Design a protein around this ligand. Structure first.
Ligand SMILES: NC(=O)c1ccc[n+]([C@@H]2O[C@H](COP(=O)([O-])OP(=O)(O)OC[C@H]3O[C@@H](n4cnc5c(N)ncnc54)[C@H](O)[C@@H]3O)[C@@H](O)[C@H]2O)c1
Length: 202
């Protein structure tokens, strides 16, 4: 199965053990601390351009190339579960202002439709994907939590040390990854959607 971390201290210690062996260059370091400052713009942008880079500003082509190069030194030694909060727009423009009932919970119709659109499908992401070793308090409050199951040996780095705001168990997966949506259910208390997905690599 997949190591789901449950203790904040073994998680931070396990990240630390991984980070010390990376042997990253100082320019790859600068490129990451950058990435965590303006993550959404960069993904926001890469989405609209369907991953093709050849024609961007020089600042970004040198940045994105370095980010992709980092992942040669950053690999997980075991199957691992990573987490992520998301807002409604993540499901599509038709879910942006329909997904939440006024009382803060999920609309039962909106969820069924989303369930149908996405259950048992693959999904391709052009942005990098930012995740966390546990369901940290910074993002656990968004209406959509995703658990990713990530196979031993995959590209995945603990970039918490070189991140703008640290102590948030920050992991990064590479751009242009693909994943398959296994489950989509409502939480116990009805205010969330818990999605479960397997990283198909890429
Ligand atoms: N959200 C998390 O689980 C998480 C985990 C660890 C670190 N971080 C940190 O937070 C910052 C990045 O947060 P982020 O992950 O929200 O940025 P993001 O680039 O992944 O997405 C930005 C916003 O757009 C939405 N979105 C994602 N895909 C979309 C799509 N295809 N169409 C329309 N909207 C879409 C997301 O729900 C999010 O609200 C960085 O500082 C990063 O280090 C976030």
């Amino acid at each position: 199965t997949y190591q789901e971390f449950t203790n904040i201290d073994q998680a931070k210690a396990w990240g630390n053990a991984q980070y010390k062996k990376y042997g990253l260059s100082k320019s790859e370091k600068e490129a990451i601390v950058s990435y965590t400052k303006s993550a959404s713009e960069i993904n926001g942008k890469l989405r609209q351009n369907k991953g093709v880079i050849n024609g961007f500003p020089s600042n970004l082509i040198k940045q994105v190339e370095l980010l992709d190069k980092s992942f040669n030194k950053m690999k997980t030694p075991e199957n691992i579960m990573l987490f992520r909060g998301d807002d409604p727009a993540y499901l599509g423009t038709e879910f942006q202002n329909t997904l939440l009932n006024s009382n803060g919970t999920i609309n039962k119709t909106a969820f069924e439709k989303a369930k149908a659109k996405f259950l048992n499908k693959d999904r391709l992401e052009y942005g990098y994907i930012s995740t966390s070793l546990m369901n940290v308090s910074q993002f656990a409050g968004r209406p959509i939590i995703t658990k990713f199951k990530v196979a031993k040996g995959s590209k995945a780095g603990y970039i918490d040390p070189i991140s703008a705001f640290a102590g948030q168990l920050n992991m990064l997966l590479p751009r242009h990854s693909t994943y398959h949506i296994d489950d989509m259910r409502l939480s116990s208390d009805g205010k969330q959607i818990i999605i479960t997905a397997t990283m198909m690599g890429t």
